[PDB]
Design an enzyme around this catalytic site. Structure first.
Site, PDB file in Angstrom:
ATOM      1  N   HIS A 234     -10.582  18.873 -22.587  1.00 20.78           N
ATOM      2  CA  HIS A 234     -10.215  17.448 -22.431  1.00 20.78           C
ATOM      3  C   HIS A 234     -11.262  16.892 -21.477  1.00 20.78           C
ATOM      4  O   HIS A 234     -11.954  17.674 -20.803  1.00 20.78           O
ATOM      5  CB  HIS A 234      -8.844  17.286 -21.782  1.00 20.78           C
ATOM      6  CG  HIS A 234      -7.696  17.434 -22.729  1.00 20.78           C
ATOM      7  ND1 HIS A 234      -7.141  18.656 -23.050  1.00 20.78           N
ATOM      8  CD2 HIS A 234      -6.986  16.512 -23.421  1.00 20.78           C
ATOM      9  CE1 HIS A 234      -6.142  18.477 -23.901  1.00 20.78           C
ATOM     10  NE2 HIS A 234      -6.031  17.186 -24.144  1.00 20.78           N
TER      11      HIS A 234
ATOM     12  N   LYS B  71      -8.669  16.202 -16.063  1.00 13.82           N
ATOM     13  CA  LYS B  71      -7.390  16.767 -16.566  1.00 13.82           C
ATOM     14  C   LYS B  71      -7.119  18.096 -15.863  1.00 13.82           C
ATOM     15  O   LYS B  71      -7.617  19.129 -16.301  1.00 13.82           O
ATOM     16  CB  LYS B  71      -7.315  16.952 -18.091  1.00 13.82           C
ATOM     17  CG  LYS B  71      -6.564  15.858 -18.831  1.00 13.82           C
ATOM     18  CD  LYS B  71      -7.422  14.652 -19.150  1.00 13.82           C
ATOM     19  CE  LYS B  71      -6.627  13.687 -20.014  1.00 13.82           C
ATOM     20  NZ  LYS B  71      -7.169  12.308 -19.873  1.00 13.82           N
TER      21      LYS B  71
END
Ligand SMILES: NC(=O)c1ccc[n+]([C@@H]2O[C@H](COP(=O)([O-])OP(=O)(O)OC[C@H]3O[C@@H](n4cnc5c(N)ncnc54)[C@H](O)[C@@H]3O)[C@@H](O)[C@H]2O)c1
Ligand SMILES: NC(=O)c1ccc[n+]([C@@H]2O[C@H](COP(=O)([O-])OP(=O)(O)OC[C@H]3O[C@@H](n4cnc5c(N)ncnc54)[C@H](O)[C@@H]3O)[C@@H](O)[C@H]2O)c1
Ligand SMILES: [Ca+2]
Lengths: 277, 279
Positions: free
Chosen positions: B162, B166
């Protein structure tokens, strides 16, 4: 184990040997008699610490009377050849012998008919790699619950097996069939069979020792715009997954017999539903 | 042929809101040429496809909705706004009887679902609208409950990528891991391998260079005790199109439920998947 003893026919075949070795290591009792195919001679093989007297198929009546009188609770495990499937099954059903049939091919409709009709305790499953069966049945659950969910997506399917199968695997076909219900358009002829060993190794990742016993599948599903990519693989080297699933099937059928279930004919889905034992 | 309700996308100037509107237009849904933007944003005219949308300040939302309702009585609202606006936008939609698809995350999720259910407003509230990802997640869980311990003894590795920052395992990864535990895998959430180096995101996860700040790539590997059986499952999303395309499907599904006057009012993305493809 409180499990029935097992007779593995043919303990000299590749999968049959793997099953017997796994049965022994797991602590099942392996009956020290086995039946080998037409054109193979009698012999003594060592499975673990068990010496198995392998007898010619012409002797199968005598052999089974001997197994039945010494091991009344025996369950037969059949990994033979497509040619023997329906005959071996009719033989087991006539004799009242409970069996686990892992052999592929034969007339699958007549096979299931004879087992159900005779009321013989059996597991007939052409894929005994239970983890592979769970993946297959997931794709089909997805397909039933969520019809058309991948409508518009592109499918590629690639698979590798020993060049002793010219054909798309039954497992690949069953998964593709689910994928069609999910809205993929893909004919069976589009499966990409990888059969060059150089390519099986360098591109599919099959180890050199497993070129003559493996089953590698890859399914890719891509959105029309190319921004969504799903990839599912199940890669089997050698035969231990079939061996381990067969042990579980025997443990499951043992119990059904001990309980005297109304239901007689089971499959590998039924075994998976019961959990690991 | 779609034959669906027209859609009002609030906010068509937001990133996901714009993507939804563009995908709605390209698919052949009718886009209502009015939108509501957030507090502190001005009025403006934007082009979505070849449709000019009059973007109005949220202070004008009463006037705006009277105008939408008199020209497009069957309108369904699609809300991709901001966590801050979620509960208020929802109460506004329910008070006005406007059916809605809420894709915005955050807010008080309990109050949100309460107001929608209590008012009996036709709605889809789904914080994950990438429907193909939802289908995979939900399959794995069904499979997991049907076949307890099926992979007992196997080893699990989970890798996912991601945009950087994150810190937490994706809700999708956690839900799949939870199913994988029912299949007999023994694996803590902390053992997920977050891939956050761009060099590695590209070279190892296959993330395209243009999608390094907007992607969600997951890899689950399951290996037998003897190392001879390898299962690998991947689901890789680049940018916003899967959320856009799922929103269109959600609108098509809700359209039908409204036309049929279903007893059931509040749906989620599983319900949409169960309704089949409508395109
Ligand atoms: N269910 C599964 O998961 C699974 C997995 C792998 C292979 N298979 C199948 O299992 C079968 C065996 O595969 P393999 O790789 O072990 O092949 P193999 O040829 O090594 O072994 C088969 C053995 O069966 C013997 N045989 C033939 N007729 C017989 C009879 N009437 N009675 C007793 N023995 C007999 C042969 O002599 C041979 O040794 C094939 O049909 C194959 O397609 C099934
Ligand atoms: N369901 C899903 O799978 C999914 C996928 C992606 C993003 N999202 C979520 O959608 C939301 C929007 O993401 P984004 O990148 O489009 O945000 P963004 O910041 O690009 O745009 C949000 C817009 O909402 C507007 N806004 C704020 N309050 C409003 C109100 N009361 N009425 C109308 N408009 C208002 C803002 O002016 C802004 O332009 C986020 O909460 C995000 O987490 C959900
Ligand atoms: Ca703007």
């Amino acid at each position: 184990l409180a499990a029935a003893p097992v007779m593995v026919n043919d303990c000299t075949g590749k999968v049959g040997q793997a099953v017997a070795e796994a049965a022994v290591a797991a602590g099942l009792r392996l009956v020290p008699l086995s039946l080998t195919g037409p054109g193979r001679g009698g012999k003594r093989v060592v499975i673990g610490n068990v010496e198995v007297d392998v007898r010619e198929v012409s002797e199968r009546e005598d052999v089974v009377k001997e197994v039945i009188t010494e091991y009344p609770n025996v369950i037969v495990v059949d990994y033979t050849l497509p040619a023997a499937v329906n005959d071996n099954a009719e033989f087991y059903c006539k004799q009242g012998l409970p069996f686990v049939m892992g052999t592929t091919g034969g007339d699958r409709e007549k096979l299931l008919d004879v087992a159900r009709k005779s009321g013989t305790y059996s597991i007939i499953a052409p894929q005994m790699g239970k983890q592979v069966v769970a993946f297959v049945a997931a794709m089909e659950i997805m397909a039933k619950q969520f019809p058309g969910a991948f409508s518009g997506y592109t499918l590629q399917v690639t698979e590798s097996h020993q060049s002793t199968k010219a054909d798309v695997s039954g497992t690949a076909l069953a998964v593709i069939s689910s994928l069609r219900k999910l809205g993929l358009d893909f004919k069976d002829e589009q499966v990409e069979l990888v059969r060059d060993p150089k390519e099986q190794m360098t591109r599919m990742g099959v180890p050199e020792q497993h070129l003559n016993g493996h089953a590698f599948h890859t399914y890719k599903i891509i959105s029309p715009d190319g921004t969504v990519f799903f990839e599912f693989k199940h890669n089997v080297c050698g035969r231990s997954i079939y061996a381990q699933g067969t042990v579980d099937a025997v443990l499951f059928l043992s119990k059904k017999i001990q309980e005297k279930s109304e239901k007689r004919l089971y499959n590998m889905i039924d075994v998976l539903e019961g959990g690991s034992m």
